[PDB]
Amino acid sequence: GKSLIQQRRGKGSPTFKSPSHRFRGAVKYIPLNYTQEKTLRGVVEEIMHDPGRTAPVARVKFENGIEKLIIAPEGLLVGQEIYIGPDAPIAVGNTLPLAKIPEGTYVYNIEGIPGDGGKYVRAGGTYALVVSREPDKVIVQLPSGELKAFNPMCRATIGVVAGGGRLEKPLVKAGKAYYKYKARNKFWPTPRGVKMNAVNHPFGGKEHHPGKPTTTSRRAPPGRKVGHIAARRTGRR
Amino acid sequence: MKYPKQIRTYCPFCKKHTIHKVERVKKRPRSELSAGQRRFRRILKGYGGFPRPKPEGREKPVKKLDLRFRCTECGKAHTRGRGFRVKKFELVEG
RNA sequence: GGGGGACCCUGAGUACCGUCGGUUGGAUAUCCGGCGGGAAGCUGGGAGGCAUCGGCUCCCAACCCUAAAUACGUCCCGAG
RNA sequence: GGUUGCACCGUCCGUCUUGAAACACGGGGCAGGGAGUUCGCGGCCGUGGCGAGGUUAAGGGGGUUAAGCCCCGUAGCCGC
RNA sequence: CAGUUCGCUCCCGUGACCCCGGGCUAGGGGUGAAAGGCCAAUCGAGGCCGGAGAUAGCUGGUUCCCGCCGAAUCAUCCCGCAGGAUGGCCUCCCCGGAGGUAGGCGGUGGGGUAGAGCACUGAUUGGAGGUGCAGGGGGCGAAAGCCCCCGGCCUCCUGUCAAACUCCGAACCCACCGCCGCCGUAGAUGGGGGGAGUAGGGUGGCGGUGUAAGCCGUCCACCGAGAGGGGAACAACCCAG
RNA sequence: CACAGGUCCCAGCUAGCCCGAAAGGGUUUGUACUGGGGCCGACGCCUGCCCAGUGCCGGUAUGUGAAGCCCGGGUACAACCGGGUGAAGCACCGGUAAACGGCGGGGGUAACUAUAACCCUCUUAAGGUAGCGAAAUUCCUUGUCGGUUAAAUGCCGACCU
RNA sequence: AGGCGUCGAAGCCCGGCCUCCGGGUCGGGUGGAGCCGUCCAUGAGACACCGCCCACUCCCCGCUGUGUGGCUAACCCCCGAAAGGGGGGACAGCGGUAGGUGGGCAGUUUGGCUGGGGCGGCACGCCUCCGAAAAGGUAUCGGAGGCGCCCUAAGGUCGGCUCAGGCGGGUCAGGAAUCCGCCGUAGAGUGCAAGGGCAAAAGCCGGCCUGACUGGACCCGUAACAGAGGCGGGUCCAGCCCCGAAAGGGUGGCCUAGCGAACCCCUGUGCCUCCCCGGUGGGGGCCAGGGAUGACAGAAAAGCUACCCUGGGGAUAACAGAGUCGUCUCGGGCGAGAGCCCAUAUCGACCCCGAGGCUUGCUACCUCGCUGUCGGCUCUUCCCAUCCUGGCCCUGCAGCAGGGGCCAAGGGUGGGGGUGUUCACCCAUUAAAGGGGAACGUGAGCUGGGUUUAGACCGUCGUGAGACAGGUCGGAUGCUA
Ligand SMILES: [Zn+2]
Structure with missing residues (x-):
């Protein structure tokens, strides 16, 4: 017989490839060698809408002269000062090692392993709860409802991702859906x-x-x- | 069908009529050292479809009797003609 | 150029064994390759169509080269 | 010999088919081309050589403008 | 005009809109708002060249003259039924040497068909006689039984039958022996070898089947493979080869 | 056909799904308000019963279960025969129907005549609930009744066999 | 049958201990010379002693695997040009091998006969009777039935006896228990279908036995004539035997069914053989018996196609043509009966003989290198078995009208509703609103509503692809005579 759409997607044809040139770039943390054992302050320069991100982004200029793109948390202010390091104050927009975040706090952009660049909880309107802090692991409850253990030195940012609540408003129009999925080149x-x-x-x-x-x-x-x-299982429980 | 356990019959080796026990041949599995089995296993190896017929459920309702008669004097066995077909075969001391 | 020696040298993941795939007339006895094992090494080693033991016969692998007799005709003489 | 008239007779050609003028298929006209070939093995017959023997193959020499012609060639094959 | 066009009429016409240039996705693959749609007039697997002169039991074709003899479509076997093999029927050559038998007369044997018949097996109208017969039902009687019928079973008379009946039984066919006739030493009966073709048959008489047409066998007469003379033409009918 | 909306399933990242011979790669400059995979298909009221069958998921005490390994026999060595260990998978147990699909039959039914409606019981898991009905589904069929016409194999409303 | 004991024993105390807390083992201590059985009981004798053991169990050493936890140093992942840092970790990944799952992807099969094909059935292997035509042979999806077994006896032989049914007579005892006499050609029986044969038997009852055997010949049948692998049968030679006094009989069942190639495998039995010789293990070969192909002279094997393609077939279906007329339409003979009586005014049972080719069917003769279908419109023509119009006869014909029948084909036989409809039903008129033939007249005249492709929906069936002589919407009509 013929091929399925899911099979054809694996060959990376332009019909299925992500148009990763309209976007604002990759959002990753500053290299761990800068964050570890040293705290830096950065100034928020602008807040922008990334075509495909599901969340707004922001530009940060750091004291050392590095310009970076970050996922702006809810309530972030242009011209605001943020801190990244082990000795940064507990506040929205600051990035701390997971071992320095008090239990019961909401965090986002959690590194899977120390220095990778952040992999978990990056969509708009999501957050994770810091449950426990142990010398060997830090337990965090993720949006899916799973308690995952992270290395204590993993880096995460405090706050919530801006842009939450989208699904409250229906798309209504097939044309609205057309533009939505064309923005990402998703099969529609x-x-x-x-x-x-x-x-x-x-x-x-x-x-x-x-x-x-x-x-x-x-x-x-x-x-x-x-x-x-x-x-x-299937059906309605 | 009843059948005597012993009968007096001609012996090719004693060249006379002697008492013979009635025995039934016991079927044995294919010998892996035989040339036919060697060739079969040799051709089964490697890629390709099955190289031989595969009959399924092809059995006669009643099979012929394969009997051997052993002489009580010389101790050698022989066959007496061709077998016959009976569903029930019993050996009676009579 | 010949005789004697009791001293030294003669090719290793190789020969070879087990299994799997291909190939072969190679049939339990063709050759190549993969995987897992793997020696002796001159008081030595190999072959003789299933395996092993003894006799006999014939040889010295795991390095290298080699004209003439041959295959072809883009092309050239000659012929039907 | 060309055409034509009279009397009688006569429903084209090829093909499948039990059966073709067929309302079954192939058929406008002319010219040219057009379809049991070669090799290997085997069974037979027509003829010729030799005969318990028959026959060479690859190849060699002589001669030749030449691949023609002359002689050798017993390996091999069939028969006894 | 056109290997998809023209006219009137009709629908959308700020959006999932229409178009252009530069790019990517390539054949069991691409693309698909999903019609097996589209992928250069080709799409239930594109085009080009090669395998390749593929294969088929299926269709068509196969070229000069005369002379001699001259079939077959019926038995067995095959995933066999539009195809093949072994036989039967045709033709050509050779060995063998003294017989052979399509027709007829007489004889010695075999037969069970047509016809006929009930002596068996099975069917079949009525009547007479004999049998209590697990018949059965009534009169009769406390009960046990008798008397009536009807039925069953045998003999006879009367009136009818049989592809799977026969106490009988032809015409006729077959085997063998003697003879007439014919053929044969100008070489038969017979034996060996080479080459086939034939495995759809038709009409006509008979038999089974069918409302009938027809189907299925049998007889070898005619067409097939056959001219001439007739039945008005006519395959098959008559004369005739 | 699509569509916005509904609902179900896989996946915490070296994941889930997919191309390939491999290397590597698409989703991915992505991270559950996400990516991928089905079905229905605005909106309003609702979506009943069934896990025996097939499928999927979890467990797997127990049986079977290939090679390899071990033991005994056999072979001056092997081939070969018997037994032990024995994963996955099947057998076995449980969940799962907005998974595939199913939702009959009698024993009956009585009271008024039909009606049988409530109603009780057995074959196998259950015996079709709310709705709709001669329908794009109805064989008999041009079903029957009413309206529409002078006349109705049509159309509309109703009945339920 | 004696063994233990200063080579230190009886009889009490508690300590640890296993355990059917049965009952036994044992360190210490006062202890200072005795304790069991041969005797008998127990199916099997010593807790007399000397030995190998089986049943559970633990411990010390060595090796071997499995599961769990931990470590980093291989390996993997991330950051970074690198350096190096972080995380996982002997897992994963990779290579080899072994089993399962696996229409994701392929190559294939899914038989034949057939009064077309499909469903059905097996006429697809055998036996009996008729068909069958008095030698032999002979076919159909011809007719009537059986086989795919069973029997150590239902096989061989020898002796003896005679069956089914009926009649007369007998205690329980009757229709039927068990007997006695007579008649009794088989009307019984055979292991089984049918046919044939069998009466001092081939049947019934008894005695012995295994010839239902080994090594081989020739011949008949399947399969006439006229070819045959395999199979079955018949006539014999030899061996060793069975029964019988002997003759004589026995190579399965009284004769005809009850079954099967190559290759491979199992078994028996003797021999030959395996690459220079010899031995051992093993292999190969000759002969005999067995495991099956029922599609039965022997491939191992499921469907859709309406998206279909190719080569053919009128050897073969649907429409039409042709033959036939079972059926259809329309006549006739007889006359039981109904008609107040009266068979024939009218109807006419039960039976029987026909006409047409206007309904349907049967056959498969022409047409599948193409003859375009139903219905409607337009137009032409013909038959009478006549609906009206012309003329008549009978009448259960008063008139007006009716019923039956005869001659007669010049003319007419119309308009509408639903339905694709022909037809049928209905409405209002009319003298009537007849039935049919012409390739079911007429598509190189028209229309395209029905039918019969390709798209799609519903119901039912199927796991599925799909299907439905079930509905439903859409779906092309070439021409210069
Ligand atoms: Zn003996």
Whole structure:
């Protein structure tokens, strides 16, 4: 038969590639060699809308002369001063090692390992809760509801990501959806396998209905994982 | 079908009529040292489809009796003609 | 140029064994390759169509080179 | 010999088919081209040589303008 | 005008809008608001060249004359049924040497068809006689039983049958022996070798089947593969080869 | 067909899903208000029962279960035979239906005549709830009744077999 | 059958201990000379002693694997030009090997006969009777049935006896228990279908036995004539035997069914053989028996196509043509009966004989290198078995009208509602509002509503792709005679 959209996405054709040239650049922390054992103050210069980020961004000029792009937290002020280091005050916009953040605080942009650049909790309107502080690990509750252990030296920023609440407003218009997904080159509109042809999808056929159960095994090979993949349960609980 | 456990019959080796025990041949598995099995295993190796027929559920309802008669004097066994077909075969001391 | 010696040298992840794939007429006895093991080394070692033991026969691998007899005709003489 | 008249007779050509004038298929006219070839093995017959023997193959020499012509060639194959 | 056009009519016309230049995604692959749609007039797997003169039991074609003999479409086997092999029927050459039998007469044997018949097996109208027969039902009687019928089973008379009936039984066919006839030493019966073609048959008489047409066998007469003379033309009918 | 909206599933990052022979790569200058994968398809009122069947998920005490390894036999060495260990997978147990799909039948039913409506019980998991109905679904069929016409295989409303 | 004991024993005290707390083992202590059995009971004898043991258990040493925890030094990931730093970590990744899952991706198969094909069935391997035509042979999806077993006896032989049914007579005892006499050609029986054969038997009852065997010949049938792998049968030679007094009989079942190649494998039995010789393990070969192919002269094997493609077939279906008329339409013979009586004014049972080719069907003769379908419109023409119009006969014909029938085809036979409809139903008129043929007249005349492609929805069936002589919306009509 023919290929699936998910299979074709793996080949990186322009139909499926991210247009990573309209954006404002990558958002990563200053190299760990600058942050460790030394605290720097930076001034917020501008706050901008990144075409594909789901959150606003901001430019920071540091005392040492480095210009960086960061994910602006809610309430950040242009011209505000922020601190990055171990000896920075606990406030919104400052980046601290996880071992120096009191329990019960909201943080964002958490490094998976010390110095990677930040990987967790970067979408707009998200935050993570610092639960416990131990010499070997710091427990943090993530937006998905999972308690993950981080190395104490991982860097994170205090506050919440600006731009939360988007999903409150419906898109209403197919044209609104068109522009939204075109901004990121995400496949839209989307077809239905049941109304595809048998050559194209496992569920295809003249009679619009799957001929097999829709829960597919986790051991299925590529080109077969459609529908509910390795679903423990289905339906309304 | 009842069948005597012993019968008096001609012995090719004693060249006379002697008492013979009735025995049933016990089927044995294919020998892996035989040339046929060696060739079969040699061709089974490597890539490719199955190289031999695979009959499934192809059995006669009743199989012919494969009997050997052993002489009580010389201790050697022989066959008496061709086998026949009976569903029930019993050996009776009579 | 010949005789004697009791001293020294003669190719290692190689020969070879097990398994898997390809290939072969190579058939438990063709050759190549992968994986896992792997010697003797001159008081030595190898082959003789399943394996091992003894006899006999024939040889010295794991380094290298080699004209003439051959294959072809872009092309050239000659012929049908 | 050309055309034509009279009397009688006669429903084209190729092809499948039990059956073709066929309302079954191929058929405007003329010229030119057009379809049991070569090798290997084997069974037979027509003829000729030799005969318990038959026959060479690759190749060699002589001669030749020349690949023609002359002689050798017993390996091999079939038969006894 | 055009291998998709023209006219009237019709729909959208600030948006998921229309168009242009520079780029990327390439064939079991791309792209797809999903029609198996589009990917250079080609798309249920593009085009070009090569494998390649692919293969087919299926369709078509196969070129000069005369002379001699001259078929077959029926039995067994095949994933066999539009195809093949072994046989049967045709033709050509050679060995063998004394017989052979398509027709007929008589004889010695075999047969169970047409016809006929009930002696068996199975069917079949009525009547008469004999049998209490697990029949069965009524009269009769406290009860046990008898008397009536009807039915069952046998014999006879009466009136009818049989592809899976036969106490009988032809015409006729077959085997063998003697003879007439014919063929054969100008070499038969027979034996060996080479080459085939034929595995759709049709009409006509008979048999089974079917409302019938028809289907399926059998007989080898005619067309197939056959001129001439007739049935008005006519395959098959008549004369005739 | 798409669509905004609804709902379900996988994934805490060296993840989930995908291209490839490999190297490496798309989603990714991304990080659960996210990326990927199905179904329905504005909006209003709602979406009932069933986990036996197939599928998916978790456990797997127990049975089976390949090679390898170990033990005994056999071979002057092997080939070979018997047993022990034995992963995944199946057997087995449980969840799961906005997963695929199913939601009959009688015993009956009585009281008035039909009706049988409430109602009780067994074959296998359950026996179709709210709605809608001769329908783009109805065979008989041009079903029956009413309206529309002088005349109605049409159309509209209703009945439920 | 004796063993222990200053080579220190009986009889009490508690200590630790295992344990069926049964009951036994043992360190210490006053202790200072004795304790069991041969005797008997127990199926099996010593807690007399000397030895190998089996059943559970732990400990010391050595090796071996599995699971868990920890470490960094291989390896992996991140930052950084590098240096180096951080995180994971003997996992992962990678290479080799072993099993499972696996329409994600491929190559394939999904048979044949067939009064077209499909569903059905097996006429796809065998046996009996008829078909079958008095030698032999002979076909159909012809007719009526059976086989894919069973039997150590239902096989061989020898002796003896005679069956089914009926009649008469007998205690329980009757229709049927068990007997006695007579008649009794088989009307019984055979292991089983049918056919044939079997009566001092081939049947019934008894005695012995295994010839249901080994090494081989020739011949008939499947398969006539007329070819055959395999299979079955018949006539014999030899061996060793069974029964019988002997003759004589026995190579399975009284004869005809009950079954099967190559390759491979198992078993028996003797021999040959394995690359220069010899031995051992193992292999190969000849002969005999066995494991099956039922599509039965022997591939291992599921479907859709309406997106379909190719080569053919009128050897083969749907429309039309042709033959036939079962059916359809329309006539006739007889006359039971109904008609107040009266068979024939009218109807006419039960039976029987026909006409047409206007309904449907059957056959498969022409047409699949193409003859465009139903319905409607336009237009032309013909038959009478005549609806009206012309003329008549009978009448259960008073008139007006009706019922039946005859001659007659010049003319007419119209308009509308639903439905694609032909047809049928209905409305208002009319003298009537007849039935049919012409390639179901007429698409190089028209229209394209129905039918029959490609898109799509609903119901039902199927796991699925899909299907539906079930609905439903859309869907092209070439021409210079
Ligand atoms: Zn013996």
